């Protein structure tokens, strides 16, 4: 096929967000454009086709399920309530033949003038004082746009050789914290692209405030979803 739809989720997945389980929303989003096979990794809380496997971080589970996958893997998060069409992010991976497709929404990363290619990325913790950019990136890309108020949906379209490389080394444990920055710094062929919606929800439930905001935001989405 073309994607594997990894829905890694390692009773948080069964939280009553909008009178439905928290894991239902990513599953419902996936079961709207094909995706007849789904691989779900979680603990002993399991209840369209779903393949569960009780088991850690993200790269460890990806290596655990490495034999099962045979093509590109679509990494999805357990807590993700979005109303954006997946085609907007799939087109970047398809037309440009990129190695990674990423999705952000407005509330450090660097994008070019078009605002669809990822050039630089560094969190506040990694850098001590000074944000340093190599002269080569500025030579190839003169204008760089920086965004500081973006959130991450944990939606990545990985390739096959990326997973093959991740398999042989266990140093990387969290994908979001070690894999994407590695690809960003390695390309300066490896290409990384990002997509910004700027008008949707892209809500990732990870705190009490986000929990209550998601509760407020469910009903109008559900009025059209169902």
């Amino acid at each position: 096929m073309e994607f594997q739809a990894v829905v890694m989720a390692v009773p948080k997945p069964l939280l009553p967000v909008g009178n439905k389980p928290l894991i239902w929303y990513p599953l419902n989003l996936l079961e709207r454009v094909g995706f007849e096979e789904v691989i779900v990794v979680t603990t002993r809380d399991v209840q369209p086709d779903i393949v569960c496997i009780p088991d850690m971080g993200t790269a460890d589970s990806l290596r655990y399920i490495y034999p099962k996958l045979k093509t590109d893997v679509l990494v999805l998060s357990c807590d993700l309530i979005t109303d954006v069409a997946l085609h907007e992010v799939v087109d970047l991976f398809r037309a440009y033949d990129a190695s990674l497709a990423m999705l952000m929404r407005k509330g450090f990363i660097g994008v070019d003038s078009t605002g669809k290619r990822l050039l630089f990325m560094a969190n506040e913790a990694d850098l001590d004082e000074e944000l340093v950019i190599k002269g080569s990136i500025l030579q190839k890309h003169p204008r760089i746009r920086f965004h500081t108020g973006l959130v991450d949906a944990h939606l990545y379209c990985l390739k096959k050789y990326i997973v093959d490389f991740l398999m042989e080394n266990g140093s990387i444990t969290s994908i979001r914290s070690e894999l994407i920055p590695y690809l960003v710094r390695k390309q300066f062929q490896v290409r990384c692209y990002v997509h910004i919606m700027k008008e949707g929800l892209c809500s990732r439930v990870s705190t009490l405030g986000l929990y209550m905001e998601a509760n407020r935001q469910v009903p109008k989405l559900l009025s059209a979803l169902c």
Partner: protein, 413 residues
Amino acid sequence: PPLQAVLVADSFDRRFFPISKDQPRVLLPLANVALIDYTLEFLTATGVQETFVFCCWKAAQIKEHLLKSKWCRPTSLNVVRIITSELYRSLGDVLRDVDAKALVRSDFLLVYGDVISNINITRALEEHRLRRKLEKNVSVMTMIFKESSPSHPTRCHEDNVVVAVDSTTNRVLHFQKTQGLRRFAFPLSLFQGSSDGVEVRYDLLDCHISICSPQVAQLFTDNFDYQTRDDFVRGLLVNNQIHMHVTAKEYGARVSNLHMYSAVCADVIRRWVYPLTPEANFTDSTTQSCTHSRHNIYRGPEVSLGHGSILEENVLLGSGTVIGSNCFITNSVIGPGCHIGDNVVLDQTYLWQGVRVAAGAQIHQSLLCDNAEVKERVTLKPRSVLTSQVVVGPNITLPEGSVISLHPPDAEE
């Protein structure tokens, strides 16, 4: 209120100091026209009605040359005032003098004496005034840039800068040079203090043209440690706001070194600074008349071109020049009164007035000053500067980077 401008004739740096022992930098001819004439023409075309000229060293020559220019005629719309003082040592000194003399009363332009541009400031000044009035005098400087490519020949490594601006409202937040720098660094204040556009631009050419404010001189005088404008703009964004503007269809550059001088001269020859062209005769001088031909070939009166000579590309020839037979001149500028020999090959070579070249000489990418002489069977390597009155003999070859001057300490003799 009428528009005013301040012109700094003396360049306090010594970049052009194999040759400046006889003539100032402003009087160096680019296309047989002085750089100060180019700056005065640009100021007059942009709308300046009063220009202040500050001269520090070799002031007599500049003063006597300005009076002969058309800008000093009674029927002029741009009054030029010449101020001479031997105590000047940097731009900060002249700015403090202007502050003490109360010469300026409103927004004025601060440009050097070797700036060649055709930018008409009529919208950048308007938005600068609008944002000064709206916020009640928080913006003090509106620097002018030009969008270009980092690989352009007009972007010298000694005049390459990287800045971080706000996309919403054009305002400079960081300014630093890139001389011998590989990994540039930007402070965290921009990202962690504000938002809505913190983009970084590395495609801007420094035109060295700025729109100043009456309080800029007072800020310069308050701190008795400012010498150049770069130090002022670096120290202001340490605590008043500095904004910026970008042009896309016009041209602007300041001659600082030999490489940039050659690049600007080549751009001028190729009509990149239209309408400021050699055949336009903006100086209103009878001895600088010229006619435009195919392949950007310019010929003046009494060219006396010989038989067999080929002008392959854009060539500027002065009045009274003499050209032999079987010559080959391309991408070269020849001053008035020159006497070229036979079988002489010129490529990217600049010749001033009074230069005599013997037959069989091969000159490539060299510069010859006034009254320079070259004997027969002499080959000049690229980037070989010859000062005024050089009598280099025959059967000699100058290596790359060779400089010959009458003064003993200046390399060779």
